[PDB]
Design a protein around this ligand. Structure first.
Ligand SMILES: Nc1ncnc2c1ncn2[C@@H]1O[C@H](COP(=O)(O)OP(=O)(O)OP(=O)(O)O)[C@@H](O)[C@H]1O
Ligand SMILES: Nc1ncnc2c1ncn2[C@@H]1O[C@H](COP(=O)(O)OP(=O)(O)OP(=O)(O)O)[C@@H](O)[C@H]1O
Ligand SMILES: Nc1ncnc2c1ncn2[C@@H]1O[C@H](COP(=O)(O)OP(=O)(O)OP(=O)(O)O)[C@@H](O)[C@H]1O
Ligand SMILES: Nc1ncnc2c1ncn2[C@@H]1O[C@H](COP(=O)(O)OP(=O)(O)OP(=O)(O)O)[C@@H](O)[C@H]1O
Ligand SMILES: Nc1ncnc2c1ncn2[C@@H]1O[C@H](COP(=O)(O)OP(=O)(O)OP(=O)(O)O)[C@@H](O)[C@H]1O
Ligand SMILES: Nc1ncnc2c1ncn2[C@@H]1O[C@H](COP(=O)(O)OP(=O)(O)OP(=O)(O)O)[C@@H](O)[C@H]1O
Ligand SMILES: [Mg+2]
Ligand SMILES: [Mg+2]
Ligand SMILES: [Mg+2]
Ligand SMILES: [Mg+2]
Ligand SMILES: [Mg+2]
Ligand SMILES: [Mg+2]
Lengths: 294, 292, 282, 294, 293, 292
């Protein structure tokens, strides 16, 4: 995979130019394959000002996740003020957890590692355990680090005697590198999941800072609608967004995203017609109302 | 070795239709995904071949194809772009497969119709790599539509009793759908019969959903007419309107059958002549068959 | 190898075709006409159904250039044979493999469902790809209700994805080039609605009525020597109230034994007339 | 890799400087790869005074694990006073078992070997069996030794005819080196596991010193809370730790660790604010109480 | 390896000094690597007087395994009185099978070969088949021989097509050397296993002498407890071992070993203390307080 | 060294039994194959040592040995010659190895029994040369039988995941098989337990296959009798027929072991005396052992 070597070299050079301290460090081959899956902030478009309706959760995320990890000499006064061993983002679908991860890669200066199953599980015997060990060793090398397993429930499923051999030893490798004897040096394991119940009890044990990114309430739906509708031109009087926010009974954040898109199209209908035959309509209450059936 | 021939054929055709993709190379799994790419020239269904769904065709255009196919038209606002995924759900035989066929026909997106045989593999972790290669290929073929036909089985209600490779495969799929590394203009169009069997997260990231429902009187009329083209009808003895409304609750393919069987009924004499070596399709054949 | 060489010697145009391993495992379950003993003169009491089967199943499939005049004169995507037990459906399939020159594929669950992950979906894809290669083809899933059962969220995952693979190859985007899916079933109700929807040419092979039972009785009793006067088959036919075709087969066997009783005794050391049937069927 | 060679050389020189009697011994290549995964006491921060709520278990661990292994000439009186063939640490998650292993590497002078699946299972045919044989041969060379397979249930899973061949032969190699004909000379196999049931009966049979590191009771939760809160400044009167210990109904040790961290942050909130704009508040009952919902 | 070469040279010289008739025989390299894994009696501490609760099985083991192999001119009267082609020791865990092998290496004078998977399966192509062929050729050279594959179920697992190509040809090589055309000259293949069911039917078929080393009964638990407690000082009256024996409901031999070790430490608790800063007679208190009937 | 001595010994013995083999020389790999040639004098099993297989022995003769060993007898018709290969398949312990032994004994063909240790080599392309040398040697030793014991491992279901040297080795073997359509009067006799694991092409060029099945009552009788020769039995207190039809499903070697154990159990006194004739082998030992 020549694209994988290009990605490894690109991600490496970028990692050594933002943090010059990592130059003297070399890697094994599996560590380089893990380096192929490192997300830097410049390729992510979501910030905290792009996340709405979660401000207390953003502040808690800061005060107990980023600052205890990113600035240790600030917290060096007490030995029990340091970063968690792992963070779990769990909740109903479409409430922000993926953008929480995106803005964690954006604001927090930790070398962010977002890896998936395709880069962990391998065909050959014992390669995937070595991939996990290389992942954690790389995280120890990149001392401020966040290892992200998106959709982490599948990876941390209820262990059973009917599991596949490699899967079981892979889970044991992962847990050991998480809370084993050679403890990770300032390495955080941030995970996003939709079903917390499918996670094994030991895995959840060592994933101890867990945030309920729940369905948005009236305030949260208001802040989300407003956050989504930026860079679009609204209406002065014929538009009341408050009722619309509350009218969406139990709608998640992405359900709002889709309804906002569909209404943006329904308001720009004349723009579609004009550029089909060759001034967006102020986004007022008509489109949202005719769509969502209050 | 027909897989290699299909890969090479589909690739050369992809680079001759769109010349900008010559500099791009692929990994092996990406090539196995390339083996399952449908081009428009091998599909014989168009929008003029789909009847009784004209408002749905127009909605499909205005919110699926143009927001995907022509972005610089839609660059004025950041919330005018393509959906992350489209679902075609409804009762059986209402058009969804031909909706996909004509999406591969009219829409110029590099259409990927893949099935379970090309995703699931015997070996450990190969199927997750197949999914990652699928989406990476879709990102390479920047205007793309990835189509999982009969998508309910793939997106079934997730459970702790699932198979491990199935569960991690579902997680890989969802992560490539709405993860951090967001897809660049990649749409995931899916057809399903039972929307309820789809998991809530999978449905959540599949937000453009169309009810391709059972055809009504207008829709049955337009379908009957669309099907009966290229066949020779009758002037007076035929009244198609009553027949359209007589087929209460019949799906589109059920109509396709009462039309084939009646075509055979009428042209029995034509076959008889060839046995030795057509008839105007009027109300008699349809009426004697469908029992009002 | 045997089925392959026989397929290329009957139809020479398929020599240039290459196969995949799973396609060859599907090739292992192909039925040629020479190993089947049932013809349309071996099926009795179903003559209108045989004629309908011809005119809407075999000829629309076997002779397309005859029907090339209209685009809606083609073959059924699939053909269901449903009805009460023992009415002829298996012999309908046998004589479809006999008379119709389509490369007949009769497969069962043992050759589809496999232990390993994702092998069975590949087996289905290879089955249909082989059917596309053997362009006039009939794929036959005997006892097809179990395979096309009411889909549920409590199904096994490999079963569910296998059903989805099957349906997708039946009426998905890439069209099956002249490939027919003929299925026999006893309970049509257990078939899923989508499966039934794409299997629309459905024939009710029902319980034989007096006239049909007469024809069945006559068809079964060939190659056996009957009686001139003391035998009246008509009453016997109608007297079998609601008996299926195989029920008639068994009663005819038992009466053949009861008439050949002296033949048993002689080889240990009769004209089939009304006595044996009458004393048996009450 | 080259870092693996550096780790082998470092671990070797440290092993020969702590115990001078092993200078004359040389190793095969696989034995050196096993030497790459040896944990010395100086890289582990946990001692027995760092383990709370397990004092009878610590004393039993001493009297039947360390002293029968570490001091044999003391027990040479009777032939049935020697070290066990293996020790299992099993129990519910987060009750101390990895710190039990850490302090076994700390206090007990046995040349501790903590190995994982990434260093055992290899891609090539028959390498992993040779890795196991080299592991035990090295343990025999380093005569007072403890071999530690963290999360040992995955490695000792219920055997089946549907196992992978390399996995099955690897299990047979391991068992044979554990209780075969060439018996190990003073070599102990200490293992930690969460689910004892997944362990095969033969593997458990030859792992006969098993400790139930169970969920902490009221006394144990008291001792754990006290052990965790050292090096942090508490309150004199407004703090009553006893109720807090017995308020945590069924909480494991790490669940207490996380709640203590979160309360330390919630008490040092003014320190966060001060170093954001530039003492620690005595850790009293308010933080723990407002958090844990008694 | 230099340690491996020292092991080969040491095992070789010891083999030629115990049995002088093998001096004229030379070996190929693979045969020498097999010679590196030969167990002589002097490095094993277990005898038949160290095995308890299995006397009828010890006597059967003698009469149908050792003597038919070790003394052939005694059995030369009939052609059907010779050694088995293979012996299998199967049973529940911890019932004695490993010590059965140890005392087979101890009493029986056969040149005992205990080999494991690390010495058979190799990385390179076709080396492991040559290792098997060299193993059996060496066994034929060392004419009274016992080849031991400890934990033999993994090696003789149910053959399938899902198996590795080397593994399969290795199994075929092994079986062919076991009961092929060039029959082994007085070579016995003794194997120990815990799960007999995982063994392939052909592999089991050529392992016709199979012993059920089952869980110990009341008599067997009595004899085991007594065998284990030798060289330790017991009590006269306050100790009744019979009840202890029967009380251990379904305990294997090693479960008894561990119990006995724990109770020895619980009785020597005073000696432990004193020596750290002679032994209490091992009476019923320690066993009773531990095993919960 | 030992290989060289074995090669020289086997060669000189081959040229002294058949003097027509002198003018022929060999390549090095052919000599390594010559190192694995079994002559009749080192095998103790004959056709009077095989019991319970007399129809199979006669079929083996009439369609395997005589069509190979005596061609000028069968030169009348071109379709009366030796098979390209013979497969002995069946349940374990039914006689197949002794079938091979007595094929090396009675049949005068220069028997080659080879195993995988002599075929598969470490170096690249040596093992294909070993196969080619094997068959070339068989062509030189014109009446020949090449024996691969445990053939199913060698002839396993071919797959794309097989080792390259293994796959090319299988292709070399098959090519040398179809090459010799009795052109060099070379027969490939193989014994296997699992016929199903054999590849279809391998099995195809292996047409003469014998089911050496589990012994029936007659076969168990003949086996028991064959095994108990050279041992002294009893006149009245011994009824063997009972024992023969009593061993329900026992293979031949299962009988061998039970006969040994009963021989020991009857000679117990003789053994004792010698430790410081045999008891007539009567029904007591067998009955007390086999549990009906
Ligand atoms: N709190 C929020 N504020 C603003 N936009 C949001 C919020 N939550 C969701 N969205 C919109 O929904 C889309 C996807 O949401 P996201 O995937 O982050 O939620 P999620 O909880 O991770 O979803 P899932 O649980 O299904 O993985 C984003 O593109 C975003 O525009
Ligand atoms: N709306 C329609 N207009 C014209 N023909 C139709 C329509 N719907 C169905 N048909 C006929 O039915 C056949 C199959 O329909 P199709 O498979 O597209 O329906 P579907 O909704 O996808 O059902 P399923 O999901 O069960 O396959 C087509 O060949 C077509 O001729
Ligand atoms: N119509 C018929 N004409 C002549 N014989 C018949 C007829 N129907 C059944 N039989 C006799 O019954 C036997 C089996 O019937 P068959 O299996 O074809 O019926 P079926 O409806 O397919 O039953 P099932 O679906 O339960 O298998 C045949 O051997 C045949 O002799
Ligand atoms: N008994 C205890 N005394 C003091 N602290 C403890 C205790 N148990 C757990 N902890 C705290 O919990 C953290 C992790 O505990 P540990 O991982 O040792 O538990 P464990 O029993 O090994 O569970 P697992 O096997 O699931 O890891 C430690 O950092 C420690 O601070
Ligand atoms: N029959 C016995 N007599 C005396 N001691 C025994 C007996 N069986 C087991 N033991 C004790 O148990 C320990 C291990 O037993 P051993 O490994 O021989 O049994 P095993 O059946 O081979 O075990 P496994 O089945 O788990 O391989 C020995 O050290 C011994 O002290
Ligand atoms: N038909 C038989 N007649 C006499 N003895 C037999 C017979 N079959 C087996 N035996 C006895 O079994 C022993 C080995 O049997 P053999 O190996 O020939 O069986 P097999 O069918 O080749 O089984 P496998 O393929 O498992 O080796 C011989 O020593 C012989 O004494
Ligand atoms: Mg997500
Ligand atoms: Mg469809
Ligand atoms: Mg039927
Ligand atoms: Mg732990
Ligand atoms: Mg053992
Ligand atoms: Mg054999």
């Amino acid at each position: 995979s020549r694209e994988s070597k290009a990605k490894q070299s690109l991600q490496w050079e970028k990692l050594v130019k933002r943090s010059p301290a990592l130059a003297e460090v070399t890697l094994d081959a599996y560590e380089r394959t893990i380096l192929s899956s490192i997300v830097t902030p410049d390729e992510i478009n979501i910030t905290f000002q792009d996340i709405g309706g979660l401000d207390p959760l953003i502040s808690d995320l800061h005060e107990s996740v980023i600052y205890p990890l990113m600035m240790p000499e600030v917290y060096s006064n007490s030995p029990l003020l340091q970063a968690p061993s792992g963070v779990l983002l769990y909740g109903p679908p479409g409430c922000g957890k993926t953008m929480l991860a995106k803005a964690l890669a954006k604001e927090s200066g930790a070398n962010f590692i977002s890896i998936r199953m395709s880069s962990i599980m391998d065909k050959w015997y014992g390669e995937s355990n070595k991939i996990v060990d290389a992942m954690f060793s790389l995280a120890n090398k990149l001392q401020p680090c966040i290892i992200f397993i998106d959709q982490i429930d599948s990876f941390l499923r209820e262990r059973s005697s009917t599991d596949h051999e490699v899967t079981a030893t892979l889970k044991a490798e992962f847990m050991t590198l998480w809370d084993g004897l050679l403890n990770n040096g300032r390495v955080m394991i941030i995970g996003a999941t939709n079903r917390i119940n499918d996670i094994d009890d030991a895995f959840l044990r060592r994933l101890p800072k867990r945030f309920l990114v729940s369905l948005p309430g009236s305030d949260q739906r208001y802040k989300i609608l407003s956050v989504l509708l930026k860079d679009t031109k609204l209406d002065e009087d014929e538009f009341d967004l408050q009722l619309i926010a509350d009218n969406t009974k139990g709608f998640s954040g992405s359900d709002l995203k889709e309804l906002c898109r569909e209404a943006a199209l329904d308001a720009a209908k004349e723009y579609i017609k004009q550029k089909r035959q060759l001034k967006i309509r102020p986004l007022k209450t008509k489109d949202f109302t005719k769509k969502l059936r209050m």
